[PDB]
Amino acid sequence: IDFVYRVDPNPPDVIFRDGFSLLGYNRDLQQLISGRSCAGGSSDSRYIVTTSDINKTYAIARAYYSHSKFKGNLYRYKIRADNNFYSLTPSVNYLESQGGHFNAYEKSMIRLQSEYVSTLSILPENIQKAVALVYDSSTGQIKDGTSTINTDYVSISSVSNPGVIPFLPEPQANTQQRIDAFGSLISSCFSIYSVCQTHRGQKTEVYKMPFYDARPVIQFIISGN
Amino acid sequence: EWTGDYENIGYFSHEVISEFHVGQIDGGAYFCIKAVKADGSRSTPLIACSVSNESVWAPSFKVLLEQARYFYVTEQSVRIYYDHNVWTNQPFVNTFSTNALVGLSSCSAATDCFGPGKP
Amino acid sequence: EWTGDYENIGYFSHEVISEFHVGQIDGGAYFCIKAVKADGSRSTPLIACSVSNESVWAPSFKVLLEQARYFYVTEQSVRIYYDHNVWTNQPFVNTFSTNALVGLSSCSAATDCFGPGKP
Amino acid sequence: EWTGDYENIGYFSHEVISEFHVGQIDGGAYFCIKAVKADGSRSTPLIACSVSNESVWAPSFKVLLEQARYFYVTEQSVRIYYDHNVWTNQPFVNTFSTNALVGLSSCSAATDCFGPGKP
Amino acid sequence: EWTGDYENIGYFSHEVISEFHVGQIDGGAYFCIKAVKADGSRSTPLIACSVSNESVWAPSFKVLLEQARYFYVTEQSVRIYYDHNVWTNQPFVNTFSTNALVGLSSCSAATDCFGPGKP
Amino acid sequence: EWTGDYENIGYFSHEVISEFHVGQIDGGAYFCIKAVKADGSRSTPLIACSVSNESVWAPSFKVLLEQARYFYVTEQSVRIYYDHNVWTNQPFVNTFSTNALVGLSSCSAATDCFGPGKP
Questions:
Q1: What burial class does residue A123 get, using C-beta atoms within 10 Å of its C-beta: 0-12 exposed, 13-18 middle, 19+ buried?
Q2: Does the keyword Signal apply (chains B, C, D, E, F) (predicted)?
Q3: Main-chain phi, psi angles of E103, to 5 degrees
Q4: Residue D26 distance to chain F (closest CA, Å)
Q5: Structural domains of chain C, ranges and CATH numbers in brackets
Q6: A93 touches chain E (CB under 8 A)
């Protein structure tokens, strides 16, 4: 519910200077879970999606480090949730109230992905912890490396807003679309290229991700399989 | 014996399945669901466990199992039917309540919860 | 007797499965559906239940359970067939309907559906 | 018998399963699929059924049903094999087809289809 | 044979199934899980197999197989209950520990894990 | 007989299941998978089948299907095990390979695959 953790493969001296920001203008909510505005489709999200639990961060790190093509490092960043940080649950039922169509496939990935969305650029003043996630060749499990800690954090101790996302467009009826999750049922907004990763001209050229369809997999787990 | 008997069977409405234990007892598989109220939180968590090869509700084990998983993976406000005072194995009881699992009806908000009910 | 008998086995055109119930009736397991109109029109809900050990619609209980769950997770327009006047258990008929689930189509248009229908 | 017997078991490649239907004919259950080519060039769609207790292809009913459900939910361009002149029930043949679903092979590209094919 | 016998069988809490193996030994299907801590704290992993025709935990194989998959597909915290001296096949004990998967309980957050636990 | 008897059963690591296939040969519903290396440096794919009613690996069919389907819906580097020269049907071994899928590990790339490699 607070101090959401986001995985980015950038050294702290870059993120703590030029923090996460919006990669587009698509402010709709149905396409955020479906991964249409996050590195799989239009890729123009108005929200930056962060997990509220540490475990999904290790899930992301394991997913990215286990393809033999992710040349680079990784870093868990702790972000102090502000008023511009909305949980994904009390913004879906409301959309379902006005006529939204969020089926079980979409409804089953908010519990899986503890998604908190920021409708504003994540300024460096909110980042507190920068823990390096190293993929040691021994035992092949993600380990916390050096933990960069600096005084950029501002002591406000604000909590994520539990209301609805303002200015959210009208819900999209029907449209049973792809969900586009990567790794182990991780919604593809947590991927690096679901963010604004262009600081220099050639800053971060890492392999993006292979995104698979999640809803066949959700059908796999919910059914007797 | 019926899920909506409403005399031997009790029910708790608007209770999302929070935790899902699976194991084996006395030679038969079993699964217990711990569910708390979806709208906020009140009362005590409801622990209802279904055991195959035991009790009169064994035939509806699998049908409930893959349904509870559905109501677990897809967090849904459901109406859990339980048969209180069916389990006698005291080690089993001191962990999970005496309630069994006999019905799992999906429900939409506080309006018209599905499944059999009381007058 | 077949799912496509238009004289006996009726259907309800474009509908969406709203609710879902699972439970145990005398002898075995059962499940129930509360499909309403997909477009949102005002119509009597089609409460259709299938019992794993009752009527001639028992051998198709497992297929119907899985496909009703599939068309419930995906809120598709479905043409639900049902045999009428099947269940004789009176408490079952008060809380549910005599409609016995026999078939479940996958309507993907606004003028026709997959499956048999009245000429 | 085998789905690779191109002399009698035909097939159509690159056909996404568009419509689904489940029911029961006589004793056992059955499921039918309507498939239209993903390219959209074809006009007459393919209609392939499978009965759990009637055809020679009965033993492959549940597995092909699960594979059809997965290819339907994912909407993959899937090569579909079917046997011709199988059903003899006149209400059945005049409603879906005289075709029996026998094999569901996936196709990972617009010109790459896995499984048996005509030489 | 309960998965609450803290005297006879142990449990590892807050693990995540990292790697999943399936196969066939001695004529019966089996599945093994490699559970590591949901952190970098632990060093050695927990190898928890389950065979479908060996020892007293065979009846709960199919029920556990579906649950373990849910915790493998969704790499979530889970309490894994294991025995100690079940497997006697020398290549099997060499590759996989003698541990047998007897239970699988979902671990919500870090405050508690559902199911049996030492007080 | 075990997936990991490396003197008999071979394996290929870090292979992505490319294309699925389901059908029916003789009285059993076989399924076949085509796998290629995840890196992309491989030249020829591997075809692995798990005929349901034949060969000593028949009881693993039901566990090798739903696993492989998963490793198909999510393209993930796995270690596929195969027993060379299992099938006999000549049309089966021209269209497909002559080796039988016996086990399906789960690799985390590099060289870490959970299973009985023993090189």
A1: middle
A2: yes
A3: -160, 160
A4: 22
A5: 9-104 (2.40.50.110)
A6: no
Q: What is the CA radius of gyration of chain A?
A: 17
- How far A215 CA lies from chain C's nearest CA (Å)? 10
Structure tokens belonging to residue E4: 């609450």
Integer angstrom CA distances of residue F14 from A179, A206, D33, D106, F84: 25, 21, 35, 21, 19
Q: A132 and A145 in contact (C-beta within 8 Å)?
A: yes
Residue whose tokens read 């590209």: D109
Residues from chain F that touch A216, judged by Cβ atoms under 8 A, are 73
Place of tokens 């010109």: D111
Estimate the share of chain F in helix, then strand, then coil, as percent rounded to the nearest 5.
20, 35, 50
User: Is-contact D14 D113, C-beta < 8 A?
Assistant: yes
Using what technique was this structure determined? cryo-EM
- For residue A74, which amino acid is it? L
- Residues composing chain C: 119
Chains E and A touching, counted as 3 or more CB pairs less than 8 Å apart: yes
Smallest Cβ–Cβ distance between E38 and the set A55, A224, A225 belongs to: A55
Single-letter code of the amino acid located at A113: Q
Q: Look at residue F59 and give its three-state secondary structure.
A: helix
Tokens 């394991």 belong to which residue? A62
The total number of residues shown for chain D amounts to 119
Residue B102 with chain C: CB contacts under 8 Å: 23-24
CB contacts, 8 Å: F110 with chain A: 66, 68, 137, 140
Q: Do A103 and C70 touch (CB under 8 A)?
A: no
Q: Which of C19, C22, C54, C65 is the mutation pick for testing B, counting most B CBs within 10 A?
A: C22
- Quick one: closest CA in F to A63, which residue? F108
Question: What does the angle CA D96 – CA D100 – CA D105 come to, to the nearest 5 degrees?
Answer: 115
Kindly give, in sequence order, each residue whose CB lies less than 8 Å from that of residue A114, ignoring residues fewer than 6 positions away: A51, A52, A53, A56
Indicate which of D7, D108, D114 best probes the interface with F, i.e. most F CBs within 10 Å of its own CB: D114
Pairwise CA distance, residues C67 & C59, whole Å: 14
Q: Do A184 and E73 touch (CB under 8 A)?
A: yes
Structure tokens at C26: 């005398």
Q: Residue E37: which H helix or E strand, with range?
A: strand E28-37
Q: How far is CA D7 from the centre of its chain?
A: 17
Tokens of C47: 């409460």
Q: How far apart are CA F48 and CA F45, in angstroms?
A: 10
